[PDB]
């Protein structure tokens, strides 16, 4: 699988798919995150990069995470459980399957999406026309068999999707059509509603990822938006549930 190689071996530029994954939302500047798998364990801080080049693409790589916090002196364990990483060619996202937390150790189960990084497509460099259909995996708590189909129209700067084959019937939802907008860093992002049986059930956000090229005289020539990756919050009878979304072109 290459998990221990992803935790131990340094970054190699000849690896496939996404190579480096900057950990920012998964590890805050005051805390530390321990990852263990296949007999290896490494301690990552804030800003540290995860070597995803050794991981398999379009699959869920699972680790054992322990979230500690640095309070003046030694570290205090706040959380522990499973740490999921979904890798694509130009983007990757992380997920936290919380099993144990700190007493206020008490057993509590959660599922929260962590970092979502990659090669962001600038909103100012988007293609000005054409339809693009992205297909991929949508995965929730204890279920990675979700299928995502999200279409983007660049002429109208809109996009609508659909999630299928999830174990929870309330999570197979349709992603309402939403406009393409820039964020603070002017990345191409999409924020829309989540509908189930013609009922507004939640929200979803997808980031656009792809490569680009320049000519000999620093002029933009080629731009592609090949992947999308984000998350969704769906309301269920048992409470709010989060779902990780990733999709690419064929």
Author numbering: 79 to 182, 188 to 293, 293A, 293B, 293C, 293D, 293E, 293F, ...
How does the study describe this entry?
The recombinant subunit vaccines Bexsero and Trumenba contain an important meningococcal antigen, factor H binding protein (fHbp), which is a lipoprotein composed of two β-barrels that tightly bind domains 6 and 7 of human complement factor H (CFH). fHbp is antigenically variable; databases of genome sequences contain more than 900 different fHbp peptides, which fall into three variant groups or two subfamilies: V1 (subfamily B), V2 and V3 (both subfamily A). Here we use structure-based design to generate chimeric antigens (ChAs) against serogroup B N. meningitidis. ChAs exploit fHbp as a molecular scaffold to present the surface-exposed PorA VR2 loop, which is achieved by inserting the VR2 loop into a β-turn region in fHbp. ChAs retain epitopes from both fHbp and PorA, and can elicit functional immune responses against both antigens.
We exploited soluble fHbp peptide V1.1 as a molecular scaffold to display the PorA VR2 loop, P1.16 (VR2 P1.16). VR2 P1.16 (YYTKDTNNNLTLVP) was inserted into six different β-turn regions in fHbp. We determined the atomic structures of ChAs with VR2 P1.16 inserted into position 151, 294, or 309, all of which generated PorA-dependent SBA titres. These structures were solved using molecular replacement to resolutions of 2.9 Å for fHbpV1.4:PorA151/P1.16, 3.7 Å for fHbpV1.1:PorA294/P1.16 and 2.6 Å for fHbpV1.4:PorA309/P1.16. All ChA scaffolds align with good agreement (route-mean-square deviations (RMSDs) range between 0.447 and 0.614) to fHbp V1.1, demonstrating that the fHbp scaffold is not perturbed by insertion of VR2 P1.16. In each structure VR2 P1.16 adopts a β-turn conformation that extends away from the fHbp scaffold. In ChAs, the VR2 N- and C-termini are effectively locked into a 'biological' β-turn peptide mimic by neighbouring fHbp β-strands, as confirmed by our atomic structures. Antisera raised against each ChA detected fHbp on the bacterial surface (p ≤ 0.0001), and certain antisera also demonstrated significant binding to PorA: antisera from mice immunised with alum and ChAs fHbpV1.1:PorA294/P1.16, fHbpV1.1:PorA117/P1.16, fHbpV1.1:PorA183/P1.16 or fHbpV1.1:PorA309/P1.16 (p ≤ 0.01 by two-way ANOVA), and from mice immunised with MPLA and ChAs fHbpV1.1:PorA151/P1.16, fHbpV1.1:PorA294/P1.16 or fHbpV1.1:PorA309/P1.16 (p ≤ 0.05 by two-way ANOVA). SBA titres were detected with antisera raised against fHbpV1.1:PorA294/P1.16 when alum was used as the adjuvant, and with antisera raised against fHbpV1.1:PorA151/P1.16 (a low level of SBA from a single mouse), or fHbpV1.1:PorA309/P1.16 when MPLA was the adjuvant. Although PorA was detected on the surface of N. meningitidis by antisera from mice immunised with alum and fHbpV1.1:PorA117/P1.16 or fHbpV1.1:PorA183/P1.16, or with MPLA and fHbpV1.1:PorA294/P1.16, these antigens/adjuvants did not elicit PorA-dependent SBA titres.
